[PDB]
Amino acid sequence: LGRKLRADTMCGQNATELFCFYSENADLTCRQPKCDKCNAAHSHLAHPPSAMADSSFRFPRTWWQSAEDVHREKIQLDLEAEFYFTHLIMVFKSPRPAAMVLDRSQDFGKTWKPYKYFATNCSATFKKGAICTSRYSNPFPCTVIFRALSPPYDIENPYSAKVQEQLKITNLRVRLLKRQSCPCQINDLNAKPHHFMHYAVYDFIVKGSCFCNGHADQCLFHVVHGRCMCKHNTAGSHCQHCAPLYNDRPWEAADGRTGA
């Protein structure tokens, strides 16, 4: 959000092929394709990946999809510092496939793991409360909801390093395997349409509080930085240590319940 999200090439670059949106009406019925042209000439005809992650102050919304009918499409989200996340969100205008995986990176893109992934057949990605759960993903309609914090994690949640690793991130990626475009009245005219490849994705904004260890009131379009002037005489970007004036007293992270 509010920053660059590097990825593969945009649409139509290696093939000057027509693309169209098979959007759907409120009656769960597809509408006639709103055929346009994808290129790299003008902003209207040139829509790099940055369109999703940029100041969206205009009524028209920024569209995006894969590079060129490629299944293994990934999104790179570089960071200039440490970040924090609240929960998991998923908006996907195209039909949401069961082969959805949510992954978290620890530091400088040097770690990888299947953080969370849920679907009716979670085997598609390759306790049943975090590894994967059923009845959460469906092929249709075209146009997954989960929360990172565990049920016992909602209460008694100080801000020490013991929980930072859970919600401290360095880069973002996501993988989708299954390919499908939700059904339409493709027999709109006598001649069938063509070059309908698309993965309608609305936008991605995973709000992340300015990481200040729950101490700072203000941390250095305008975007959120990673430098905090934490109060309680605390120093450091992460504010994990206090000033030596009275540090001798044992302490842990100032939990929001009382700010010890």
């Binding site: 102050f57 969100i89 998923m90 909801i145 300015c210 729950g214 101490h215 009131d217 379009f221 100032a254």
Partner: protein, 257 residues
Amino acid sequence: CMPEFVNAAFNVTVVATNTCGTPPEEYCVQTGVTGVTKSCHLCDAGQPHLQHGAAFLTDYNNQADTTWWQSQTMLAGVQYPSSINLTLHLGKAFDITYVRLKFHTSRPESFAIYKRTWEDGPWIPYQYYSGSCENTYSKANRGFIQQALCTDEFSDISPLTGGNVAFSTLEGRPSAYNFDNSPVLQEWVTATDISVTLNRLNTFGDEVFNRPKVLKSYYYAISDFAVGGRCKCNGHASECMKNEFDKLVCNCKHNTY
């Protein structure tokens, strides 16, 4: 003779305990709908047109743009076991078959719905709608089995703009398809006074940060009560012809009203 279903939010006012505008407030919301240059503007009620009043919520519900209302934000410290409970005093026991609460800002993570069995009486909630109800509500997630169970299909802020909620009274429940032959469900669906219980929004610990904007953002906004219903009087009237005293009561046979 056939009963005719009409929007139950027509020519009616929601009795809202708290509503924006009375004090001076400055709030900011996602740029999905407002589209302001900086996505920041000040809520008010003095302006005749910008009133977020009760009537705006229950109106014709213009599809192109329906008048929206915002509840008081976290600035008022509205996060308790009980919170703003805006109620509906329609005037008849409408059989609300389909309920849709189009949210102007976003779907709140934690919230519920409370319905009135009889006028001035207690509240009988239909169902709970939260993705972590095991904490806030202390109940099992993914409600299934008649009770006011939780719901997690659409709980978190997925849409982030113009959120949609399908409060299908007659669907999504074990008794969905036995509506016409379920005595409890017949009593369930009928609600003398509708009231969405926005009991609490489960904070994500951002309060310690105490950013002025974020607190003004984690609030509630019901764009419109897209709720439909009718007099359940065996449709002695295709439309409750109001009586002399300027209210809504039903037509009837056997020398009754």
